[PDB]
Structure formats: structure tokens, C-alpha cells
């Protein structure tokens, strides 16, 4: 799965509404409406594509066929998850085989980790010794996508965000404009999302 780093920019989260009617748009820890009124330090964005029914598995505190070995959200995650249908864009009439899914591995993974090893899964009692065969399976498999399939198997594009919440010099937030500075009077103030009243 691919990830991207975003910093030193002015955001505008309303434009996301320009898209088609979504299938999943949820957030944990922050109400999505007022996202424009908070400033952030660094932004990490992950993207990938999942089968239609298994989009539910992108959720904290649950297990599944992907959460076991591929993508593991920490139990204290705060951020937003977006998922929208892609049958219109990622299907060939002849059937497309260019998407890989993990099937077997010894044990689960800690959150925010990756593994692309090609070691053979020793399912059987015999020592495979690096030889493919019976009870020595190839770790990866391929999905299928046809335009006439049902919505239950149509492809879905999913993106995950992540936040940091003002624990450092912030770099990214909305287009709110500044003003001149006044002191020695009783004034209401707002510094980087920290609001207060008093005298400076």
C-alpha cells in the first residue's frame, strides 16, 4: 500500500464534496464539519483498492481477512476514512488480474507495518525447503473484476488520513486571515486553535 506526506500548505476540505455520492465517509475523534478550523503539523495519506464487501474491514477494533495480515489500524487512531465505488474505472471486459492479495502468513502484524516477503508458506508437515508444491502454497492470490458483476464484488477505492493535533509547530490549516496585534487591554484571542481571553 502506498502512502504520501503532505506539509506546508493551506487546506480546504469542502472541495471533497464535488465527488459522486460516496459509499463510506466517516471520521474518528473529530467532527468532519469543522475541519477547516484546526491547524495540523504533518499529514499522512494512505491509498489502496479493496473488494466491494470488505470495505467494512477498514475500522478500528475489529479483525478480518485484511486486518489480519495486510492493514492494521491502531486502537487509538484518530482520522477519517473515505471509500467510493470504482466499477466505472477499473474493469476490463476480458477480466483484469493485476491486483494482488495476501493469503497466508505465520502470525498477524503490528499496526503500521508492511511485508512483501516471498517465502513459501509451510502449510504441510514436510519441509518445503523453498520448493513450491503440495502443502507449500504461494503467498499471494489475484482478484477478478468484470463490469457485469454485482455491486457486491465491484471494486472500491479507499483513502485513509491521519492527524497529529497541535503537538508541534503547526504547518497546515485553513485560509483564515490574520490581523494586527494589540496588547495591554482585556482581549479575546485565538492562537493556532487555542482560544482564550485575557491580557497579553
Amino acid at each position, epitope marked *: 500500500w502506498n502512502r504520501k506526506r503532505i506539509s506546508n500548505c493551506v487546506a480546504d476540505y469542502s472541495v471533497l464534496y464535488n465527488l459522486a455520492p460516496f459509499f463510506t465517509f466517516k471520521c474518528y475523534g473529530v467532527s468532519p464539519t469543522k475541519l477547516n478550523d484546526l491547524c495540523f503539523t504533518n499529514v499522512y495519506a494512505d491509498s489502496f483498492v479493496i473488494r466491494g464487501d470488505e470495505v467494512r474491514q477498514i475500522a478500528p477494533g475489529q479483525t478480518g481477512n485484511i486486518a489480519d495480515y495486510n492493514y492494521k489500524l491502531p486502537d487509538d487512531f484518530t482520522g477519517c476514512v473515505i471509500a467510493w465505488n470504482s466499477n*466505472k*474505472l477499473d474493469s476490463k471486459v476480458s477480466g*483484469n488480474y*493485476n491486483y494482488l492479495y495476501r493469503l497466508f502468513r505465520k502470525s498477524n502484524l503490528k499496526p503500521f507495518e508492511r511485508d512483501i516477503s516471498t517465502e513459501i508458506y509451510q502449510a504441510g508437515n514436510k519441509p518445503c525447503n523453498g520448493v513450491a508444491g503440495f502443502n507449500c502454497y504461494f503467498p499471494l492470490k489475484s482478484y477478478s473484476f468484470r463490469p457485469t458483476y454485482g455491486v457486491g464484488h465491484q471494486p472500491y477505492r479507499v483513502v485513509v488520513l491521519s492527524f497529529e493535533l497541535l503537538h508541534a509547530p503547526a504547518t497546515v490549516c485553513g485560509p483564515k486571515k490574520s490581523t494586527n496585534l494589540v496588547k495591554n487591554k482585556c482581549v479575546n484571542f485565538n492562537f493556532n486553535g487555542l482560544k482564550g481571553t485575557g491580557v497579553l
Partner: antibody
Amino acid sequence: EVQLVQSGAEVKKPGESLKISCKASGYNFAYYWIGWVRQMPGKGLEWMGIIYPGDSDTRYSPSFQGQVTISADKSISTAYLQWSSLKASDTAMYYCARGEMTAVFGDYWGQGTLVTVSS
Amino acid sequence: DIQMTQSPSSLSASVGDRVTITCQASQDISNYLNWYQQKPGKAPKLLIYDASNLETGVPSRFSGSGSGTDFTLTISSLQPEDIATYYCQQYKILLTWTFGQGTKVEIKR
């Protein structure tokens, strides 16, 4: 067996309107994409826009947003390229092509259509 | 914005020779390239639709490779039936598309 058919050439004068059409058959028409390309003599090629007639959706280039219109009919399996107003610097050849997003474009192309406008 | 460059603008050679051509970019674009051939006439044709993958229905005198921003195409054995135009183009945005500049070939006799 896939074929493309176009409307004929055309000459007109500034201040008017015009429409062009492109038609194909030999496959399930609703499951592919159509695109337009402009080419004016002495220069290179330059993309204009695409469409997915199966479910009406349009996209446009940064250099031609809000200038030309694209649509299609799935009943007769045809795509329409339509204008609103004409000016003096739009003389060039136009191409309609059929493409597929995942793997390849331009596996086939039309025979090419011409336009001329002057006073 | 994304901008291409081709090199050289033109060249000429004779039969039974190796020929090469280069296409360059201002930033890495992760092997989403393709090449188009268009002989003087009507229809541009697709020749190579990936970094090193060729469309079916074309003999095996063509090759090419590249990554990052360095990309080369070549023909091992020139044949007299090859007089046309060539271009390289790219794609990473859903719609931000552009072709290159142009390469000219001429034969020796």
C-alpha cells in the same frame, strides 16, 4: 471487427454554430470510452476531452474548460461534439478515438474530419 | 504542470542499422509512458504502451526501456518501410495530458 464513421467536411463563416458526430459498432458500446483530439497543421497533437456515454460524465482540459460541449446517445450508439460560437483561429483536423482506461488507448482511430471557417 | 522534451529533433540513417531516440521529463512519473507513430496520412498508431511492453500485431524489431525521468526507445535493424512521425506521452492525473515535440527520420541512399 470495430469500425468508426464520421460526418463530412464543412466550411462556414465566423459568428455561427456547428456539430460533428462519430459512430461505431461491433462491440458492447456502453463499456468503453470516447475521446477527441485536435491537430492543426504545423504543430503537434493536443488532448481535448473524453466521455463515458454509458453513464453521462464529462471531463475537460485546463485549456478548454467552458468552450466546447460533449455528449452522446446510447440508443443509436453515437457521440456528438457540439459548439456554441465560432472564431477565426479554430481551423484544424479533429479525431474521435475509442479507449479503455485500465490497459490501453487508441487501439483504433477514426478516418479524420476536417473543418474550415473564414470570412 | 508537466512538460516533456524529445531528443534529437531529427536524424537520418541507412538500412540495417541501430537507431535510438530519447524522451525526458521534468519530474519522475513512474513508467506511465507510451509512444505513438503517425506516417504522413491520417491515423496515428500505437506502438509501445508501457516501459518495455509492446502492442500485439507488430514485429519484433523495436525495443525500449526507462524509468524515473530517463526513457529511451530504439530500433535494432532499420527497414525502408519506416518513414513516419514519433511521439512520447505520459499520464498520471485523471486529465492532464500532453504529447512531446517530434522526431524526424530520413533514409540514406
